[PDB]
Amino acid sequence: TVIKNETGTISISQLNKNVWVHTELGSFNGEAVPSNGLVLNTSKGLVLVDSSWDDKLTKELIEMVEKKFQKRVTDVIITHAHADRIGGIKTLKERGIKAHSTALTAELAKKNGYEEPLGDLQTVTNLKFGNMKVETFYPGKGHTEDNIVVWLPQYNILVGGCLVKSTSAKDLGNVADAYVNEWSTSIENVLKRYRNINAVVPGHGEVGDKGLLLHTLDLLK
Ligand SMILES: [Zn+2]
Ligand SMILES: [Zn+2]
């Protein structure tokens, strides 16, 4: 169920046979916070949805999953250019792990001093790893200008990233790079595209369902 790792904590929790949620604790003085991502166990290797806060955590995460599932992490999908998502890009690049992203996320990463992910993802991109099907979708601006969501069609699981707030989120969090007037439409775009959702993974907090999208629409009011 929940597999842990000490100091600067990393934890993985299984959702289904081949889908796990990775959660790491990132803390800089007074703010402290656990972000989420996915670990996809495919027949072709491990695929991660998002890396982690920094390189130190990213290495630990990779090492933890490689040892457990007995296969290499081959690809990573970066959902937006902020640190909790792209902080481990250097580790991914030096280890030969493919870092997928939209051209805009790549640009923004480069603009902010990070190494560049691939910039290969379009508005809708369908990938397949082993037998695992993965769809990436840019619904428009919200938490950031570039935020994308990730959909697993075989399980109807949606990784909302930071565009989606958990039940425990009582506010919009960091809106410095946000588009609060477009965020609602972007969320509506996700609801329209995926009318039948089984689970929704927020960028931070507990896993939920379509309700988390409705919760975010309310926070935007
Ligand atoms: Zn962010
Ligand atoms: Zn975040």
Curated annotation (Swiss-Prot):
Comment on bound cofactor: Binds 2 Zn(2+) ions per subunit. The enzyme can also function with only 1 Zn(2+) ion.
GO terms under cellular component: periplasmic space
InterPro entries: BcII-like_MBL-B1, Beta-lactamase_class-B_CS, Metallo-B-lactamas, NDM-1-like, RibonucZ/Hydroxyglut_hydro
Entry annotated with the keyword DNA-binding: no
Residues reported to bind Zn(2+) 1: 80, 82, 143
Disulfide links within the chain: none
CDD domains: BcII-like_MBL-B1 (cd16304)
Keyword Signal assigned: yes
Keywords assigned by UniProt, alphabetized: Antibiotic resistance, Hydrolase, Metal-binding, Periplasm, Signal, Zinc
Binding site for substrate: 165, 174
List of residues binding Zn(2+) 2: 84, 162, 204
GO molecular function annotation: beta-lactamase activity; zinc ion binding
Cofactor(s) this protein cannot do without: Zn(2+)
Gene3D superfamilies: Ribonuclease Z/Hydroxyacylglutathione hydrolase-like
EC number of this enzyme: 3.5.2.6
Localization: Periplasm
Coiled coil: none
Activity modulation notes: Inhibited by captopril stereoisomers and iodoacetate. Also inhibited by chelating agents such as EDTA.
Domain of life of the source: Bacteria
Main location: periplasm
NCBIfam families in the cross-refs: bla_Bc_2, bla_class_B_core, bla_subclass_B1
Function: Confers resistance to the different beta-lactams antibiotics (penicillin, cephalosporin and carbapenem) via the hydrolysis of the beta-lactam ring. Active on cephalosporin and penicillin.
Quaternary data: Monomer.
PANTHER family attached to this UniProt entry: ACYL-COENZYME A THIOESTERASE MBLAC2 (PTHR42951:SF4), METALLO-BETA-LACTAMASE DOMAIN-CONTAINING (PTHR42951)
Record family assignment: Belongs to the metallo-beta-lactamase superfamily. Class-B beta-lactamase family.
Name listed for the protein in its UniProt record: Metallo-beta-lactamase type 2
Source organism of this protein record: Bacillus cereus
Classification of source organism: Bacteria, Bacillati, Bacillota, Bacilli, Bacillales
Gene transcribed to yield this protein: blm
